[PDB]
Design a protein around this ligand. Structure first.
Ligand code: PRO
Ligand code: PRO
Ligand code: PRO
Ligand code: PRO
Ligand code: PRO
Ligand code: PRO
Ligand code: PRO
Ligand code: PRO
Ligand code: PRO
Ligand code: PRO
Ligand code: PRO
Ligand code: PRO
Ligand SMILES: [Cl-]
Ligand SMILES: [Cl-]
Ligand SMILES: [Cl-]
Ligand SMILES: [Cl-]
Ligand SMILES: [Cl-]
Ligand SMILES: [Cl-]
Ligand SMILES: [Cl-]
Ligand SMILES: [Cl-]
Ligand SMILES: [Cl-]
Ligand SMILES: [Cl-]
Ligand SMILES: [Cl-]
Ligand SMILES: [Cl-]
Ligand SMILES: [Cl-]
Ligand SMILES: [Cl-]
Ligand SMILES: [Cl-]
Ligand SMILES: [Cl-]
Ligand SMILES: [Cl-]
Ligand SMILES: [Cl-]
Ligand SMILES: [Cl-]
Ligand SMILES: [Cl-]
Ligand SMILES: [Cl-]
Ligand SMILES: [Cl-]
Ligand SMILES: [Cl-]
Ligand SMILES: [Cl-]
Ligand code: NA
Ligand code: NA
Ligand code: NA
Ligand code: NA
Ligand code: NA
Ligand code: NA
Ligand code: NA
Ligand code: NA
Ligand code: NA
Ligand code: NA
Ligand code: NA
Ligand code: NA
Lengths: 4, 112, 112, 4, 112, 112, 112, 112, 112, 112, 112, 112, 112, 112, 4, 4, 4, 4, 4, 4, 4, 4, 4, 4
């Protein structure tokens, strides 16, 4: 779960 | 009121739950007709509209934000955006995006 | 997090709809078990709690307000607080208080 | 509908 | 412009003058037709409207506040609100409420 | 310096202790002669004055707030204000108001 | 309180009404004795004083601005300041200055 | 949007270039029809309007300032305002005012 | 002055015009030699420089922003960045990027 | 809450009273057990702690500052810190330090 | 440092002393060579420069404002600017301008 | 303390050094065990943790930021993220990413 | 106005000039009678007073700071405070304190 | 950039560790040549310089503070400053000063 | 004359 | 114990 | 009607 | 026309 | 003594 | 070139 | 070396 | 009575 | 360990 | 020339  | 060019923003919680990435938005009192979820290669955009009050209605209090709501999330490469699941209950929009780990991922080592 | 002594506040719309006074609160993602509506002679107090995140859960985003929510309304003498009706749907708490006008009310005249 |  | 839901406020002086409580508001350039004084069990509400400028009029300066003005005063039990007197002169709304002391009032003593 | 019209405020703790409601104010260095507790139908007003420094005294530091202190509490209907108890010790004004629950109180239910 | 050296300012509306330039000031509760209008070659200065409250009077509220009010307007060459008309009603000071257009005025053209 | 009564301001550079005084304004995307240069005895006023966006057009971004732009310059006695030259290119309004020195000017000496 | 590492930003309008996406920047008084448009897979970067004033020039006013201007736009997958068209007129940089819709696009449905 | 590393500060009055220097701190509701006065060559440090509220106690108001209070005074060479006298009454900590003037003190003259 | 285009300002006292108008500026540590007083029809401009510190000098403290100081006063028609007297002592620039009242001046009356 | 959901940020310098892009972070007093560098298609994420102080340790000063540090960089298409080199020395994390220019790159021309 | 307990501060430059430490204060328009320089073991205190304006004088501008000015400097052990020299000219108070280096001073080495 | 006269400050942790007082500074990327530790009777001064970037180097980001860093600590009489130990590792400057308690120290008692 |  |  |  |  |  |  |  |  |  |  990667997010900027 | 929030507009397309200056949208109102809605608060978000985000966390990883095992093999799924979950996002929740507080979007109370939204008509489902307005909710739009656009998914881009790796970008999720959430847009909702909550209509303005009848101009002829004299409100004694009018604190609730109205107009266009929008939030854009830039997701990592490991998120299978195509398989997004979205639900709206108790005024909360919940998104579930499966996490799809790549094979044998890079681990960067740091020299001293 | 909002506490009893420093509650989080939730936005409110208020308006008169003919013979009824209506109040709406944005309270998304609230467990009905928490909602408490206290009515005093002429004071309505709304209290809700939305639990804190599991301390062991690593959030990637945690913008949504949590803890104790509370708002107090001081109502006019004409509101039949005893007959309040309350509903919670789409994350919105709606209160309907009948308006009970007194007989032959005062109209203050201004001299010049 | 009166309120402060 | 001030609205019902977000009124403009007007400055107030208040003082006790012997057996009368006096309140004065700066409300210049108000049409008496707008002035409304509502008295509740122990609450005085003052509301005035000063109309917006003709949309077709090009102002070179437009600093004066316009729209809905409102102020609510919560008065003590000793004020005979029913006998309020109100006057408007030189752009000042003056209210005179008689003070009606109760018999043999309480005096709270403090222990050490 | 705080005045009647713009009083200095003093910090307050408030809590329910079983059948009593307790309020405490930090009011150090106050002469008991100044302390006044006024109780209204359901309003407690605390007023104190701490005198200004002798104008002829050259202070090297003068940080402590002086003049008129005042705080008003709006109490619920269940508080037997008539039986208030007040004490002043270690520079703290403590008020104890008995709580007098009404018979068979209302519990508002929320529909879904 | 406003002083000569740091005057309080009062809000102003200004507009052209055909052949007249009009200025209005909110100046409620002013004694005409105080009002002074000074006109300079092309400068209008408005000065008023609203007296401070009797030092011996304990005000419960004292929000209204007091002391010296002043505003200076720099007028264009076309204003016949010598023929100014001034009136004070409903707490509003209104000035009417005739506009006196010069013969065959300049129109600046812009090259590309 | 900027209005006559509350204009938007545009940035200005000003400098003396030998016998000429030069002023430049950033005024991009202005229709020449709007540009107006008014010169008063010794006052230059620049006014421009850039129209608002079609209300029916949904903008994704709308950061550029729109409406009425205005700036007034108070020029010294030595500027021959009557001979002003104005040009508009690359979105820049440039003004050139000849400097017309008086004969045998005053030089103020300072005593010690 | 704006630098590479801390650029000055310039205001932008953006909108969709049928099958084209349009972006406009206020960039008055820019030398075309400075303008650089870099396009990345889906990122448009606009960079301009407006030179600093000659250090030996005494400005009487110097309000206009100078130095490096830069803005980066993150464009959606549907924008054919390769076919960008750019023009600079009246101090406005206008970009036109064709929109290239994908076949049979996703429409996310929301459950209740 | 104030900590050792970020203490809460308490207000102080300081003045010279003939041959004594006096300092007073507002420290209401402090347990004497906490008060610590440390004197250094010429530095007085006052430290107090007022305990946090029982975590299990639901406060309706909790405005009073709690935790560690600390203030350090840098005293002049003429203060006989060794003979400090300290008292705590009505929530006020009062310090009395004798002033011990040196023999035939320096008086700096200023040239013109 | 203050520049021509963004000067540092210096504080001013101004008052009328019978038949003279007096202005004083705090301008400590100024070289008379820098002081320039320009008088325009009715405008007084004061300009001074206090040089920057030698770039090669390491200051331990450098709080004093340096560079260009400037202040412009717009004087009324009654000031005989031509007869200005200026002196600089104890770091104060004092200006004395005679007041030259016109014959039989206008007194504007206000109607009710 | 910085958390995953609200990380502390650390300052960064970035520059191109011929055929390499270099990024440096101030990350003093970090245990290498904490440092994690995640590289995404074109996104570099730097994460570090500096542990909180022993709760039982009384600090006299505790200004240094602690907890989770994180910074994300969005890199251009020309950066060969796969060949990143990272080193940590003197409390500085340095990243070196080779720049891999594409063949015959686009140069956007601007029309007039 | 600045007081003993809340003095106005005056700007200071400080630098080492070979074997002397120099401090300069901007103190324009000060009467020498007010200037007081107190030197403590290693502390220099500068105090000045500039009188308030005659209460009966109507100022048109009164920007210059008045009342008590004070600044305290904590000097290093190497300063021979006893040999201080002070002068006041052009509204600047200049202090010259000889530097008296100790024999064979410590140089702290840092390990790696 | 920080200068001698306006240094950049660096964060500090301080605590007592049994018989030693410890201070740590975040000073990443500092050349040991710059570090200077000056100890005064009871004052520790830490000074470091981190050089400015080559003026000819175009930075894409330049957030890290540069120039002169300085912090002064005023230590108590019990610190044997002469025996200070200093080390610099992982970008952290650590100081260790032995604590040297005096014989039979004063304990100030507080009267009631 | 009491008022909140 | 109720209070506003 | 001109004014600054 | 999509843009962040 | 007039001044703006 | 004078200007206020 | 490109970066946003 | 001196104090900083 | 004392410090101001 | 040392000073705090
Ligand atoms: O440097 C390498 O090749 C290893 C492989 C996994 C990530 N790092
Ligand atoms: O003065 C009166 O008596 C009227 C009656 C209605 C309100 N005012
Ligand atoms: O305690 C009492 O009973 C008195 C009576 C007047 C108010 N206090
Ligand atoms: O609706 C009712 O009648 C119940 C009775 C207690 C409060 N609610
Ligand atoms: O340039 C000219 O002469 C014209 C005449 C009116 C104003 N402009
Ligand atoms: O005082 C004077 O008369 C000289 C003449 C030029 C300006 N000053
Ligand atoms: O769930 C689906 O498959 C449909 C297809 C278009 C987008 N949503
Ligand atoms: O200069 C001197 O010696 C005198 C003696 C007292 C202080 N000043
Ligand atoms: O109206 C008038 O004519 C008078 C004359 C002096 C000023 N006002
Ligand atoms: O328009 C074109 O085709 C040229 C080719 C390189 C970039 N611009
Ligand atoms: O450690 C030492 O002894 C040396 C002597 C001068 C200062 N440092
Ligand atoms: O008053 C005294 O003498 C004791 C001795 C230790 C400190 N206090
Ligand atoms: Cl709005
Ligand atoms: Cl309505
Ligand atoms: Cl929090
Ligand atoms: Cl987790
Ligand atoms: Cl508005
Ligand atoms: Cl009009
Ligand atoms: Cl005050
Ligand atoms: Cl005294
Ligand atoms: Cl005041
Ligand atoms: Cl009174
Ligand atoms: Cl707007
Ligand atoms: Cl559209
Ligand atoms: Cl700059
Ligand atoms: Cl020049
Ligand atoms: Cl806290
Ligand atoms: Cl409890
Ligand atoms: Cl500067
Ligand atoms: Cl030097
Ligand atoms: Cl924290
Ligand atoms: Cl410890
Ligand atoms: Cl003051
Ligand atoms: Cl006078
Ligand atoms: Cl800088
Ligand atoms: Cl470079
Ligand atoms: Na509304
Ligand atoms: Na959390
Ligand atoms: Na208007
Ligand atoms: Na005082
Ligand atoms: Na008053
Ligand atoms: Na718009
Ligand atoms: Na410049
Ligand atoms: Na608490
Ligand atoms: Na300098
Ligand atoms: Na801590
Ligand atoms: Na004054
Ligand atoms: Na740089």
């Amino acid at each position: 779960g990667r997010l900027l | 009121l929030g507009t397309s060019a200056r949208p109102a923003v809605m608060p978000m919680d985000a966390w990883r739950e095992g093999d799924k990435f979950v996002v929740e938005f507080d979007l109370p009192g939204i008509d489902a007709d307005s909710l739009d979820i656009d998914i881009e290669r790796n970008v999720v955009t959430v847009r909702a509209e909550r209509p303005a009050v009848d101009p002829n209605r004299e409100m004694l209090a009018s604190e609730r934000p109205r107009g266009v709501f929008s939030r854009q999330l830039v997701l990592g490469e490991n998120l299978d955006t195509a398989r997004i699941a979205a639900s709206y209950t108790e005024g909360v929009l919940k998104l579930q995006i499966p996490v799809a780990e790549k094979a044998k991922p890079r681990k960067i080592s740091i020299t001293r």
